[PDB]
Amino acid sequence: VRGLSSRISIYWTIVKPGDILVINSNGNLIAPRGYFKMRTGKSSIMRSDAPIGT
Amino acid sequence: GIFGAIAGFIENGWEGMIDGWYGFRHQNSEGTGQAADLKSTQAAIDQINGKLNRVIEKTNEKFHQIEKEFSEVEGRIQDLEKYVEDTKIDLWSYNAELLVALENQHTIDLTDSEMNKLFEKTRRQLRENAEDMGNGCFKIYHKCDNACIGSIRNGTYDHDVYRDEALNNRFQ
Numbered sequence A: 001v002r003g004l005s006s007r008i009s010i011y012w013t014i015v016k017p018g019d020i021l022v023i024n025s026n027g028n029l030i031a032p033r034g035y036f037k038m039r040t041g042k043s044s045i046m047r048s049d050a051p052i053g054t
Numbered sequence B: 001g002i003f004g005a006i007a008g009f010i011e012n013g014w015e016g017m018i019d020g021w022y023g024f025r026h027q028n029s030e031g032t033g034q035a036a037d038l039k040s041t042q043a044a045i046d047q048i049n050g051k052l053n054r055v056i057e058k059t060n061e062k063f064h065q066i067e068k069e070f071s072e073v074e075g076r077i078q079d080l081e082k083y084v085e086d087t088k089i090d091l092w093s094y095n096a097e098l099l100v101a102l103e104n105q106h107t108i109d110l111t112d113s114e115m116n117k118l119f120e121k122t123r124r125q126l127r128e129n130a131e132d133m134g135n136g137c138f139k140i141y142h143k144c145d146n147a148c149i150g151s152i153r154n155g156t157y158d159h160d161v162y163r164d165e166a167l168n169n170r171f172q
């Protein structure tokens, strides 16, 4: 795929306030550069090819 | 209809009545004419609007949900997600079908009712001065000019004024 036989597998981890993240590895780690903010609300996602209008 | 007036003892409706849902047509010494009855028209309409307001009412608001279309075969968990949605759609489809059918039966019955209420209110007004001819029409046994007809439609017709005259005509 695009030249490679290799793969990366993506995983996730949610760390709650007061909690603590630890990362341990002796190879093959694809490291995070930081975190994404989590929010709650009315947000979602949809599959569509309909054009967007004003 | 459950009262037997519309599509019953009244043969048919009047396409010429364009300013009300129910009304009077009369024949007398001065000719023939028509007039809408506002208060029964408004009764039918108000009920029907009540029923529209209940139905056209605010749709619920949903946001993030489950997915409902799938590009890969996955088995157990997708079986569930599909079965869940298919079960909800059938239930809602059933509701919508029943609703429309109940409301429509009731709409046809309530409008029948109003026609029948108006007739009965009229029969009561005339007392012994008129006979029901069976087709929604009253034979009135006294001279009854346009104002007299007008008083029957206003609800201020005083039957005692015409009583000796009508009783005399009715019984001979």
Ligand SMILES: *[C@@H]1O[C@H](CO)[C@@H](O)[C@H](O)[C@H]1NC(C)=O
Pocket: B146, B147, B148, B149, B150, B151, B154, B156
């Ligand atoms: C309707 O009632 C009014 C008020 O009492 C009266 O003046 C009138 O004569 C009635 N209408 C007709 C057409 O007679």
